[PDB]
Amino acid sequence: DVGCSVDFSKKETRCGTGVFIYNDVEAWRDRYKYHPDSPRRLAAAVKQAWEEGICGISSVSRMENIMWKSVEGELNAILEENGVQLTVVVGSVKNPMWRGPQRLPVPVNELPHGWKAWGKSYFVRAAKTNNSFVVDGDTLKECPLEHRAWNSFLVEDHGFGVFHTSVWLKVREDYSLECDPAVIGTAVKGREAAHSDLGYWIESEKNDTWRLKRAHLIEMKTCEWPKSHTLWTDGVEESDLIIPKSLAGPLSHHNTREGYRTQVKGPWHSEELEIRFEECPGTKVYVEETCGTRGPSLRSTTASGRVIEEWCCRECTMPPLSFRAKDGCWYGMEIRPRKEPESNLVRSMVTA
Amino acid sequence: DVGCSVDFSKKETRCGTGVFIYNDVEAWRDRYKYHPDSPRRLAAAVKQAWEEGICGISSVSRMENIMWKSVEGELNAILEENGVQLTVVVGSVKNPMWRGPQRLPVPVNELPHGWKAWGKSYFVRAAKTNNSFVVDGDTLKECPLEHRAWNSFLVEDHGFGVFHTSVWLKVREDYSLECDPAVIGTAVKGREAAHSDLGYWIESEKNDTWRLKRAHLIEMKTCEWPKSHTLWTDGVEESDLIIPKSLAGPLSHHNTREGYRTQVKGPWHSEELEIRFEECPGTKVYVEETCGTRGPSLRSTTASGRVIEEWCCRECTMPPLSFRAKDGCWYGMEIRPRKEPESNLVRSMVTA
Amino acid sequence: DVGCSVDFSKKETRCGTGVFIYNDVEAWRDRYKYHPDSPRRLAAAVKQAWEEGICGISSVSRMENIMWKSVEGELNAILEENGVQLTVVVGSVKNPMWRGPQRLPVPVNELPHGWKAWGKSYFVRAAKTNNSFVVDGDTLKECPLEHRAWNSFLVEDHGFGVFHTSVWLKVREDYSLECDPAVIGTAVKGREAAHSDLGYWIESEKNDTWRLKRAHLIEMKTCEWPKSHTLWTDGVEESDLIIPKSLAGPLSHHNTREGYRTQVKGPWHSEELEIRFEECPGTKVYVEETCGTRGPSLRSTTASGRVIEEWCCRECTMPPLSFRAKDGCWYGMEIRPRKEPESNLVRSMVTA
Amino acid sequence: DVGCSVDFSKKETRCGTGVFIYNDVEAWRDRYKYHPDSPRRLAAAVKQAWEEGICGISSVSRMENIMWKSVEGELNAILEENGVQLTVVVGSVKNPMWRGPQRLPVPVNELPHGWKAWGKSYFVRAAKTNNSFVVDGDTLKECPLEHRAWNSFLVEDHGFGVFHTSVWLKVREDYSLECDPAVIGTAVKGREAAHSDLGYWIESEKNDTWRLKRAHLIEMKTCEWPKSHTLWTDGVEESDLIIPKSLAGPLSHHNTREGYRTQVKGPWHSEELEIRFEECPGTKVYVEETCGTRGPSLRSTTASGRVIEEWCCRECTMPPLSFRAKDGCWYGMEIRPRKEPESNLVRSMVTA
Ligand SMILES: *[C@@H]1O[C@H](CO)[C@@H](O)[C@H](O)[C@H]1NC(C)=O
Ligand SMILES: *[C@@H]1O[C@H](CO)[C@@H](O)[C@H](O)[C@H]1NC(C)=O
Ligand SMILES: *[C@@H]1O[C@H](CO)[C@@H](O)[C@H](O)[C@H]1NC(C)=O
């Protein structure tokens, strides 16, 4: 708790005791290493799960998906060692990571033998097997969405003084729609508080009342935001959560904005996204009762690239509500083009 | 907002951005300028308060006593320019700081006079007067409680922690029974959370769904704890708040103890009270079905120096709750002497 | 070795792994507390030296004087336990320290028995004897300079998790004239190189040239600066070293300035000498080739404190050169008063 | 600079002023920008070099090769925008990185076109040209090493080096084979001295003499170690410098070990080479005078991977020297296999 505290705004070097949080979403690339636990038990789990008619796993976040491409060789070799013919295939995730009903069973006992964890686990290869245990990817045709597992892992301990934090995880014996709290946090001082998650960072201020300031989205989950680590969980609803609750929208006075509602058809397809309260270049948003009602988020740019400099709506706190996507700006549901037809603009992917 | 941390149980160090809280209950605040609005307006408060039957004040906290005392002499000189004859007397604060049905009014007009109230170069005095506005102490007869005010102040600024360190203030224009949220510090992470203010420190560990861990009291206020800043506002009663809400007992699951109720008869008199869950020296608390019922906290130390060692109770949980006061050790209401008469021991006067 | 970092010039906070120097010049007062290892062997060495004709020891560093003063009692008691007729008297510290031809011999064997000294180092009782194994002091008549032992010691271990990190020395097995490398640390980074040790602190930077900026001289030694721990020791002249080599002047480009010759006649009688390049208060220096020639340095004021305000220099580059001592503001030799008799100028004592 | 320090063998901790070194070899540093002065000045320099007849550039180090990989596209776009037709093509660094005799001429005047590409990070295309100003890569035939430049840049300033982490370079006016000192750190404390730069990490231990302890290499350059930035620069011979000076072998007694000689023919082709004084896995080294004389470094294993169990040496001192790279474990010149056919010994190709 002994800290370098140096007030950047006022240049105040100080130290003492308290609690400390750090912005790791941008520093995530060079801070984190992940892995499963007991790969033999995981081989037992995948084998047993295969006995339950399980296709694969549709990862909800990039953290888990990046895990499942780490012990694929070791998992396949362990399956080979005990004679289990099972090949795991891992593809690419696509936002918004949808909700899979199945859940990975938990073995009651490990495989009868196997000690490949000693020495060499990485540089291992084995021939494919007819059976495929797919992970993410565009294998929607190979198997439907109802045979895929989802949110069947946990974080018990992470962080190490080895320059590269190694994270311990294991298959859930429980069923949950809630996002993992081991890697979430917020706290408040005076006028400022912020909701922080590995794939979601949210800025909350107190200008007049407690409101929202900004949010960044690297990944597009489908779990639920908690209330225990949420501030002011008393007197708040889901519709005003600009972040959809189904998309893990916090239930706080700090997750609400005036003149705007939950955005379910937003650019939940974009791999990367940010919610900035700024008019996108060359686009001025108006507020007029004459304007149209809400509609699916339309990108600021037409397919031809021409920009639309006139956007309107009825009951918005002007001017901006635009998603900072890689492909451009997506505007909120209330904001709709004033003159450009709503069918001409790049409509957001169906992600309600 | 950029500082570091050095964990105790682990030597790992790392840092960047973050939010930070500090503890200032051990240091009993610190030397602060204590500008109440304007000293001329503060003096003009008492002319009309005194006129409408306010013969004294019951200070809510020790800060307030410091504040009135620190300007007591100057208050006598501000009113020398106009035909006002008052003399302010500030006495030691008796605990627990009972309430005052009156409040300090808010003058609407200023007295035309020199503005030398603040920053005077000394060399000035005032004329004493028979009528006395008694501020706490032993002026119960000189001023009835019904004519005393209380909790009639509101904090505005408490910054300038580098050089000026002024606790700027204003008479709260609003009759508030709750405490002031500004100087409160709190946050929760992992298995830990802790509230903090100018007179109290609170700890909360995720022992089993959170509970009461340890707190210290340097002053027994009689305000109330706001919910929008306390964890789990919903889901706790005021009776199981081991701190009576009357004493600003927080309304949170984190503020409660198994087998212990609100300690209304606790030693809220001892100017300082440290709340620790531990057997006091030389006492063995028992859990017997045949023990006695609740009662006012009996100090573990007798007036003659003898100490009653073996105590019992019917609904306790280890470790026992004993108020570590300068007066000695005081146990909870639930824990009574096994067989030594409660009359002989130093009973805690009913502190409701 | 990891650690914090704060560069106040840019406020750049850093943490990694490497080496960490410290500025301990101000901490010479109470940096260390210790005695030489096996004071019995040092007593044997002192007896052998005295038998060999070592009337005294000329302390080379104030650290050595501190150690000798601290260990005087234990050494005396060791001498008088074995029956040795020797009293070790440790005098004051006079600047500049002057060399001692002789050295402390390493004793072939320790004294037959000196266990009573074990655990009896500071609070040590003994008597006096006719023979005085003086240690520096104002005893030039008694033990002349040529008959004093000097720089015949070494350092084994220093630095610890304590304010007074115990230092263990050793009777130098052989001759030596250089200074101690173990307590030296240095390096260069961009535009700043600093030469620092237990008693000195020298600065340098590249202002279109690597020149001298400021040097703090708590003491005045005569050993030689080692090359193994020096920067840019290639192509530098003694006469341009503002600090002469005879007073332990580093041999580096960073230890010289332009338009100024070596200062061999400066206030080298000053106990504490700090060197800065800034105009002396209450005076001014002109670049006048008609000024005085080279010679002893002068104090800015007269004996009575009269401020000699008129000064000049043959070819100095403004700002001028002056010595800051406890005595007062002393000028460089190249600067002379435009109009002041040499009788009114205090000449810096010069010792060879 | 205010930092801290925590010991590893011990647990001593402390914070204070000083200077701090940081090892970025294993820590893998951070991302860097590598801005080459004014992009148009670089374009003019390369155009003038091509007019002179410079066919390409030899990236001395991996940092400069990454700089050219980051600067290629925008330089080509700038060239095509101006009346210039020359394409820059980069590739992979080949070890050992070879020298070049040419330097990029400093342009007299900037190319006549608009300035819009300060630190332009790609994302602009250009028309290919038959003429190519190849950079490193494998275009040896297209641009012979004769007309390949080498060390044509110098680091100027490291502005915003904590987060922005940008290294700004400019075309050197004068020729210089020397490496870059600004990115070199070193000092000595007690019995350890360490030499390192942006690419190299050398550990020297004092074991009865200042001796090397370990040497790790992530690249293979050909510049030269500056003397001002190393220790014990006297009484050192190249033959005992295990690292050849041609490999920027530091000139210090710390760079030599007894019983061995310079290794100018070792596995310097390795992209990563870690030198450890230890027997190669599955191999035994002995000291036999009848052993083969010094010869090219041989991988401990064979081409098929067979391990040589018996090894001999004429003058080696245990533990034996071995180069630990991804290719495998090697042996020095003095260490020859005791009895093994020379065909199966993977010689290190001569690095001339
Ligand atoms: C923000 O500052 C204060 C606090 O809410 C208020 O006066 C103001 O209206 C707020 N909004 C703006 C746009 O300044
Ligand atoms: C160096 O110092 C001189 C005068 O001492 C000053 O004019 C100049 O600006 C300084 N800086 C540089 C980079 O020369
Ligand atoms: C290393 O340790 C010390 C000197 O540094 C000494 O005892 C020992 O002999 C040295 N040599 C070896 C091989 O450890």
Side-chain angles (χ1 to χ4, degrees), chain B residues 229-293:
Chain B
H229 298 56
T230 191
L231 262 61
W232 290 352
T233 53
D234 56 357
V236 71
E237 203 179 316
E238 285 175 58
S239 198
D240 280 287
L241 319 180
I242 304 301
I243 291 168
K245 184 189 182 195
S246 50
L247 298 162
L251 282 72
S252 159
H253 182 198
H254 303 81
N255 169 18
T256 190
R257 187 68 170 198
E258 67 278 15
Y260 291 121
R261 297 153 268 181
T262 185
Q263 294 285 303
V264 66
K265 300 185 189 295
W268 313 132
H269 63 99
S270 310
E271 264 295 345
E272 276 187 43
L273 207 67
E274 191 192 29
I275 295 173
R276 171 189 325 293
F277 285 90
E278 187 163 41
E279 287 183 60
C280 283
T283 61
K284 45 190 84 64
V285 182
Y286 290 82
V287 189
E288 305 270 316
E289 184 163 34
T290 58
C291 193
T293 60

Side-chain angles (χ1 to χ4, degrees), chain C residues 36-238:
Chain C
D37 193 60
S38 183
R40 179 179 60 197
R41 195 165 285 254
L42 177 51
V46 166
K47 177 58 165 182
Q48 184 167 343
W50 184 264
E51 296 160 357
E52 286 178 31
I54 310 308
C55 50
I57 299 167
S58 183
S59 300
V60 64
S61 69
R62 305 189 180 181
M63 171 145 168
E64 185 169 305
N65 185 251
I66 290 156
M67 182 278 287
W68 272 112
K69 210 195 305 183
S70 295
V71 184
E72 179 168 355
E74 168 156 45
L75 200 71
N76 288 323
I78 294 155
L79 293 173
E80 282 208 337
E81 161 171 32
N82 180 290
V84 180
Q85 50 272 17
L86 286 171
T87 299
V88 176
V89 57
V90 182
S92 289
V93 168
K94 219 185 284 195
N95 285 126
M97 292 296 173
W98 278 127
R99 306 167 186 276
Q102 280 160 338
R103 312 278 155 197
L104 183 61
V106 64
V108 181
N109 276 299
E110 279 152 43
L111 293 175
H113 201 240
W115 284 14
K116 189 178 178 182
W118 295 5
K120 187 175 179 177
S121 57
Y122 283 69
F123 315 117
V124 189
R125 319 302 181 182
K128 300 175 180 178
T129 69
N130 301 4
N131 298 295
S132 296
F133 193 72
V134 59
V135 165
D136 192 348
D138 302 334
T139 81
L140 291 180
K141 308 177 186 180
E142 320 190 0
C143 173
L145 178 66
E146 61 271 17
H147 297 302
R148 281 204 165 72
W150 173 80
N151 174 75
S152 63
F153 275 103
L154 284 180
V155 171
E156 300 173 32
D157 186 2
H158 55 264
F160 271 121
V162 57
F163 182 75
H164 294 105
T165 71
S166 56
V167 179
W168 306 139
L169 287 82
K170 187 171 182 177
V171 174
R172 202 184 281 267
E173 172 57 22
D174 54 357
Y175 198 89
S176 279
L177 190 143
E178 67 159 7
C179 319
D180 208 351
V183 304
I184 302 179
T186 303
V188 68
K189 173 188 178 185
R191 304 175 76 97
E192 294 303 328
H195 311 78
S196 77
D197 60 2
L198 288 171
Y200 276 17
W201 175 265
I202 301 155
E203 286 174 11
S204 62
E205 66 271 14
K206 160 169 188 54
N207 156 256
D208 66 359
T209 50
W210 281 106
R211 73 200 293 174
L212 191 82
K213 161 178 178 182
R214 193 188 67 85
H216 189 188
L217 322 176
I218 282 178
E219 46 190 326
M220 291 171 179
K221 325 171 194 170
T222 58
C223 54
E224 264 170 30
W225 192 275
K227 158 60 207 165
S228 43
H229 300 58
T230 303
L231 169 59
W232 196 6
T233 60
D234 200 358
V236 67
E237 176 51 27
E238 180 62 28

Side-chain angles (χ1 to χ4, degrees), chain D residues 103 254 340:
Chain D
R103 301 287 189 275
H254 308 68
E340 194 67 24

Side-chain angles (χ1 to χ4, degrees), chain D residues 206-220:
Chain D
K206 179 177 164 59
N207 194 231
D208 317 292
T209 61
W210 277 104
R211 73 177 190 180
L212 184 75
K213 185 192 160 206
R214 181 179 94 89
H216 179 75
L217 308 172
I218 61 160
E219 53 162 329
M220 295 296 172

